[model samples]
Target: MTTNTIMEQEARTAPQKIAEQLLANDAITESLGSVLREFKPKFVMIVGRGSSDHAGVFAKYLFEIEASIPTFAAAPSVASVYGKTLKLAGGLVIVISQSGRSPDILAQARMAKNAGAFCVALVNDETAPIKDIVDVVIPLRAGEEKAVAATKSYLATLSALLQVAAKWTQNESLVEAVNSLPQALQAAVDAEPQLRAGSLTDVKNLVVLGRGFGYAVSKEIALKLKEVCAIHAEAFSSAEFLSILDVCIRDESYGSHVEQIANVKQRGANLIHLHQTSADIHPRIAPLALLQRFYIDVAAVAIALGINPDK
Candidate 1:
């Protein structure tokens, strides 16, 4: 049998899949609440690889803003290869993986758990080996994903983590926003025409820059460009890009560095701007709008470049 179209099966299905999880999976929410109450962690550490790592980056911002908990990204090699365990008491460890089978991620989770951290696994496969060692297993509910680049599973992980943050912090506005994601994300997908008209066909290398939560989504978008279009894309914080431009010593730290970089792009070059609509919105949730747009645009770029996004 012929393989199903990958982007249609995975990327396009993300909004509904996430909506289903949020609307249907009450048990996972309850478990999250219990984990927070019992652990009451002073900080959070997130672990994952590749696309899952990008999801963890997103969660770092979420946990920081919503729960008032500082978050760290784990370097699995430190524990898995170097054989050093962390001092993890009064900490919460969250692991995100589509397979939950990576040796390094499993090692980090094990180390954290043994050090008295409350471990939570956000995995696509509930029965994956990592499940045996965690305090709570939050399913991705992304169904079957065969694409090598990972689309639905990544979004599902982010959505689940977002829900966890909302519930943990008692942010009812964020909860309502999460509930409305199905429609908002579908609107993002419907933006195909704009994405196609503004294709990056001539651009060979690019930089994606954002601040705060948008920075997390920028990394994911850069990863997709490399994975699907074979583009040389780099992600950086808006501040980091200023350093690259040798303008870090400027007297002001402006958030408009994206526009600054845009001003210098040569003619016929591509510069995709993932900017929020307004500056007044909450930083925790506003970045998601640009993230949704970025996802759809990446798929469009892959198709335009004659790539099989599923592979």
Candidate 2:
């Protein structure tokens, strides 16, 4: 089977077990609401890096719509390296990680707690360094992510966070939507072929696009491709594609627009585009992730232009 085929099969089937594990978290059922009411936080800032960070973007939407609270995603660099302080006047910080060992993220968690903010660590590793400093530690229940590609854990994080949103807001709509997620992901995978769909042999430049929560997911996927495959990849928002393309033109070395497309065209390079579909979200969960398919459709043009995935 081609890599595209495998990716597709995994998409639908891979999430099943992890989704079940996340639903089993007691925090989702027993204590989420109480914590929300008690904290009555003014803001909910999530800190995560990589695929976990993509899940953080998803969390921002869930909290705002489900809990009716203002939410944001903060990078560790923003709080630690840049010396930006968090607004903890009435807020909770949810930090996410697979290992919880990243020094930068841990620093943010510590600072949030020290600043009188409600600090929570969402991690698969309960004994990780950040655990001791956080007020609450929500385990992802995803045992281990052996694949360098990070499939199960990312889905698990999303599963856990969405349920957290449902628990706090008691939003049945969100709950129902989340309940259908595993199946929805399965369907998307089934509809799309994977792996060889974008074989490395065929593509030179990749353009990944998404907006809102999925924006982060697309960005992470692009980064992973670049990191592991040694491919040149870039991420852009569907809404900002035109502007980004323009900038990439003059600074072709750094960015591109139509010029980038033109340059790649001249080089006989294909472009691979990543997109999120309607089924990516369960209807009740109708957050920004669900509404971002326009980007994927637009990206299809790139694929049609000859981009292919490797197996």
Candidate 3:
């Protein structure tokens, strides 16, 4: 099989990995859960780089909405570049990385630790240097992701971090939903065959749109497309999309939504709409469905571009 195809295989395995980690009530999860229970921080700060950073963004939304705690994405430059530290006392810092070797992330985590914040790492490599510095290490359990574009690791990090959120808040429903995500993820992977018909080869530019938690999904998928498929794609909030659509459909107010859809169709633009079904669960967990769909879309486009996504 081709390299991109292999990358797709790794991505497909993410759901099962997530389930395995959920079932294995081992030292990592227990330790991290205990830290949250005992050191209940007033605020949260997440640190990472690249795709791991996007996972951090997902955590920001999950923590703030589900756990009702303020979360910020830390700019590692403040610690590594400027040589400054924040008053991180009474804060919880969750650092994410697939490799766990980035200097800035390590520096920021160390600074957070020195400032008396509770620090945890969501990393795939247990022996990575950052793991030695943090108070708790929650392994991604994704095994080895041979691909340069981090498909499985990103999803695993999201799953692990959200699992933390579920345990931290004592949200049994979310905990159950997270446990059930493997099936949902499998269905998403199964749905990709139908998505393979589209031809993005001639397409030069594209915009991805999502609202609420999906905005983070849009950004992650856009990054994947750019990295693997060489697409100049940008992600915008659905609100921003509609605002621009309104300007283009000026004086067409009565049929604005219809007109906007028709206009994109006339321009031969590709559009994929993702919708979630469960209102019973927290909004944060519900949007994870779209993450799966977005991954399929990225892989499909990468295949069409004749690019080995693993490279």
Candidate 4:
């Protein structure tokens, strides 16, 4: 908390913002869930870029696992640059962005709508012009984040996506998890990562690994480490690099990861493991808690490296 930068400050606000969002967005998610039940889309497309696209990665896992719908992120250049519009009818396209002003994303969404896909925008900025291109607007409600690296908006996007997934499937456990996430997020923000980022100040190359629901946050943290600390970090997900991480979800999956952890130990590589929360916590919020804790670590690392992460 020593750093007064906007990045650090904004990152801290995620818990409260999520709490607010849960209350503010309840009706919309309920209705959206009902609509999804009727539409029964055969496929889902995510339209976004950068961190927003990363949230799309989370969305990919959410829809596929929660609602049994195939989901993929569309390359904006396909429609924005090449002007190729596939038969997107009977599909769902969720457009995620903070500013919601990127023309490429706007164009992609527009094309999806024209091609008969249902379009919804999870846009944070009220002043931003994204409403006309989509069928509906779901405000991220993360507030203004002045940081160069997005913190709250990205979290808000994830929250919105989670809420949508929770309702769409009407999974009781997931719905409970979504409603309870704000408290878990607060705990995550309050807790400090055991692995300090300052320890890796000189490290140039890094790999972040995660499985199941953890994959998206790992990618996000890898992006953050490199963007803020100038460490070249790449993220890798396991074969299923996906899940709610249920107990004994798979037997050999645990064994395989054990070997990798040991391999890193044997081959002289750094390893920092952020263990999951108790099973008492729902699966939906576990990865998010890990991500929240890591943001604290990375911001401090950036400050230690004498870099203004806000810049």
Looking at model 2, residue 83 earns an lDDT score of 80
Highest-scoring model, lDDT: 4
1-311 per-residue lDDT for model 3 (tens digits):
12247677777777788778766634456566677889888998888873447877777778887788998788877888889888988899888887888888788889989988998888888889997899888878889877677777778888887778777776887777676777766665655332331546566676765554666676786777678888787877655565111111111122444455556667675565444333243444455655665565566667667766666
| TM-score, one value per model | 0.84, 0.71, 0.83, 0.90
Better of 1 and 4 by lDDT: 4
lDDT of 1: 0.69
Stretches of model 3 off by over 4 angstroms after superposition = 1-4, 25-27, 50-52, 192-194, 197-201, 242-270, 274-286
> What does the lDDT read for residue 46 in candidate 3?
89
RMSD of each: 5.1, 8.0, 5.6, 3.9
Number of backbone-clashing residue pairs for each candidate, in the order shown: 0, 20, 0, 4
lDDT for each residue of candidate 4 in 142-257, tens digit (9 for 90 to 100): 88777888887888888899998988899997899898899988887776553465567567887777666666777887789879989887777644433011111122244565
The ten-residue window of minimal lDDT in model 3 covers 243-252
User: lDDT by residue for model 2 over 194-273, one digit each (tens)?
Assistant: 23323454555767654444454556556555644555767776446541111111111223334444555566654443
Worst 10 residues of 2 by lDDT: 243-252
**lDDT computed for candidate 2:** 0.58
Q: What is the lDDT of every predicted structure here?
A: 0.69, 0.58, 0.69, 0.77
- Kindly report which residue pairs in candidate 3 clash with one another: none
lDDT of 1 by residue, 156-251 (tens): 787888778767776887777677666666665555332342446676776776666656776777787788888787778865654111111111
By summed lDDT, the worst window of 10 consecutive residues in model 4 runs over 243-252
